[PDB]
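Obj: model holo form, ligand = (methylsulfanyl)benzene.
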Amino acid sequence: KRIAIVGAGQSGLQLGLGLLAAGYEVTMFSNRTGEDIRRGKVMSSQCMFDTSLQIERDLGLDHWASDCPTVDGIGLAVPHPEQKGAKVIDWAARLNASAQSVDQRLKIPAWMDEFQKKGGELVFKDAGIDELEACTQSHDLTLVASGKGEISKLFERDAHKSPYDKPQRALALTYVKGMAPREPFSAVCMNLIPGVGEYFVFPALTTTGPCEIMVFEGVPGGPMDCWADVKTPEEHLARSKWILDTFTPWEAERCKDIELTDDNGILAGRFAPTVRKPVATLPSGRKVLGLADVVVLNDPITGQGSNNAAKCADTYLKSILARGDGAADAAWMQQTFDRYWFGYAQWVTQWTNMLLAPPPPHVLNLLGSAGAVPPLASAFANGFDDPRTFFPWFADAAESERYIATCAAVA
Amino acid sequence: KRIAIVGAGQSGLQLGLGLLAAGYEVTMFSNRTGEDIRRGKVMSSQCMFDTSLQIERDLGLDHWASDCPTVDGIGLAVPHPEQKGAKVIDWAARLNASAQSVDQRLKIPAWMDEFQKKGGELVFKDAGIDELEACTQSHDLTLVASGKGEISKLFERDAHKSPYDKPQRALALTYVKGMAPREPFSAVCMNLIPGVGEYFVFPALTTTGPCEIMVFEGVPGGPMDCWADVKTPEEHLARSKWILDTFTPWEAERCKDIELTDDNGILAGRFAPTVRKPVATLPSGRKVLGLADVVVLNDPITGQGSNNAAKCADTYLKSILARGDGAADAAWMQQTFDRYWFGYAQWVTQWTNMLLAPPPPHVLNLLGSAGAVPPLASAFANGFDDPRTFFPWFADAAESERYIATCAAVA
Ligand SMILES: Cc1cc2nc3c(=O)[nH]c(=O)nc-3n(C[C@H](O)[C@H](O)[C@H](O)COP(=O)(O)OP(=O)(O)OC[C@H]3O[C@@H](n4cnc5c(N)ncnc54)[C@H](O)[C@@H]3O)c2cc1C
Ligand SMILES: Cc1cc2nc3c(=O)[nH]c(=O)nc-3n(C[C@H](O)[C@H](O)[C@H](O)COP(=O)(O)OP(=O)(O)OC[C@H]3O[C@@H](n4cnc5c(N)ncnc54)[C@H](O)[C@@H]3O)c2cc1C
Ligand SMILES: CSc1ccccc1
Ligand SMILES: CSc1ccccc1
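Output (holo structure tokens):
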């Protein structure tokens, strides 16, 4: 009945609040104050689809639902190789239920406040092995929910579940005000630049109100691997507009008057997709369980990290509650992760790792057919809510043709 | 806001009650009265695992939860080829949360009563095309939830999702009183007779109170394809005991004083696993959507039909509620099924169709290893709650060896 969590992030706080509500005692380690998180740099574009949002609703944690703009569809565009400034693919499809992007700068600090108000023990320290050794002696279970923090490397990389050992994209974020709203409905507007990268943009809620978030992913060494020489916010905004002018002029028409939401509404970085073994053993022989990005870390190209974090914390909470007074031993830890991985995250991860690679012919045919077969576009869009629904037709050519036929027959 | 359902069974009634609670008008066609169902022959062994049970809880429909015996684990035994009357494999593992088997003779008629009390329109008739033509003119959506009824063949068989066109097992059920309870916990006791068939037994609740349900599955033409000459209840009970004496004498020790719960607590039959296309078009050109066993029908060897029905009706209810005033057209119908199939039922179906075939070597090694690696036994047992968690390690030899290693490392 006493649980410790290292890392006051999305999964750690969602889990901790769920545990307090179920009557557990929870100790949490945070390496930052709430206000420094609110005013520091953005961490994500955190587009959460309806199933993830519902996990939050069900815990009573959808505190921004009324004020956050809804994201109501997915759009996909590809530049026309010949015609200047035109697209050869340009379609959209509605989500069956809205997505929402609530800035983690808002959400994480407010959930830290709620955690304390609900009786959690917040401890402020950059935690290391010594804190984990202490926690495992005074608590029935200790989780590491540290995201991309260095302590996450305590867990052993799972080579067989990690096909990549290098970053597959160069990343940047720019949060802006003044973008022309998308009509007639909002969407994740996905621009796929063949051989170069991707630009995604959608509305969100941040610390100065509603905005849109521009998301840039560049094939390393290509024209959109282009943030190294950017050293000021102003240079960042300018490089952002430069990308749209150069590769997606249709989107640049929406951005004639964009400004940064704030000077810290920017980010640039990269990382390798990595899966890790969930059970780490400390020097003392005691054991800790990794959560969410500590054990399954994906490139953001499919917008699944925050969705994975919510779904992972839900699965771990259910497993803790079902265990009761049972021992939180390594077997239980491993089985808890196994259910998440084999039941769900392996399919999110396989799909995302496929999309980082160059698209094979059957995939380009799927993307093209979706522009003329609205049921297939709808399947694409709503697959973002449960990427299991892409298999096997997205990854295999013969099955892709069968599914196109199924969709065509009901259009 | 007006919905018609043909077939007053598990999925149709669960869906109908969910719809009434959400404010819809629901018309339902039943081909039997509630009392004739309560007193007629058994229809299933309906072992529902925790996720399915929770769908019922969440709708307020767990009316027997306190009185039904819990099923708390899974056991697996294989006879020893040499040693007489002994087993070469004999292990068990606890379920993380209980399963329960509430006889459909109890559940379906009580839910019919509740359906009427909550304002549903129950119509008593053996429905055919004429009723479907009428319903599609007076309702916004018409579903066919007819199980193995003849009208289910209105929907087109999906050859590519149906590897079998003949029954793979000869089936029988015997509901009994007086069986020695399993100690120290209850379980689905699975007896795998190599090359012959399977005997499963577990506690349940029926119309005369708590019982156990014996489940017999025989490879066609083999020693357990043995119900053709049985023509009375007494002969049925006797043939049931004969099987245990001949192939599972360890189970016969529990059955020295068993009696039928009632003369209609017996069943024998067979059918081919079949998947169908979800959208059927009537002579008028109007369309209907199939539900649960109408579109995905599996052999009962994995105990998944009632679980699939609950999960299918949950997915369809969520899809209806999300649609709102949107058209219930063929595309929406097809996408609703697609989410069920690609997201979930394809994996239940692939797993079950593999187990009907002879077990390959890596599978026999998995079953053997589970007796000495408790984390692998636990994975087997709790996989019954979400068969997605068997992939890819159950179906591929190299991945099975990797998972055995993972389980061994935390034992
Ligand atoms: C550029 C980018 C774009 C993204 N876009 C999306 C999107 O559109 N949709 C989506 O679903 N996901 C998106 N994500 C992913 C998502 O933001 C993360 O996957 C999610 O935050 C993971 O939650 P978590 O709990 O695992 O980690 P985090 O939310 O990162 O929480 C980890 C916390 O632990 C802290 N910590 C680290 N080390 C220690 C320590 N020693 N002691 C104490 N605390 C420590 C960290 O500082 C942090 O506060 C994006 C990510 C990036 C980088
Ligand atoms: C031997 C056996 C053992 C089983 N064991 C298990 C187990 O342990 N666990 C498990 O999870 N599942 C088990 N099942 C499967 C499970 O019982 C079914 O999959 C489940 O009942 C399917 O629900 P449904 O709504 O699709 O169909 P049903 O529950 O069968 O409902 C269909 C209804 O429609 C009626 N109907 C048919 N035609 C018409 C018509 N023209 N008009 C009106 N009504 C009509 C039928 O009479 C019936 O009442 C077993 C099945 C069998 C046969
Ligand atoms: C930031 S990349 C992405 C893709 C899809 C949905 C949301 C975000
Ligand atoms: C009736 S076969 C079976 C198998 C597993 C669980 C329940 C039933």
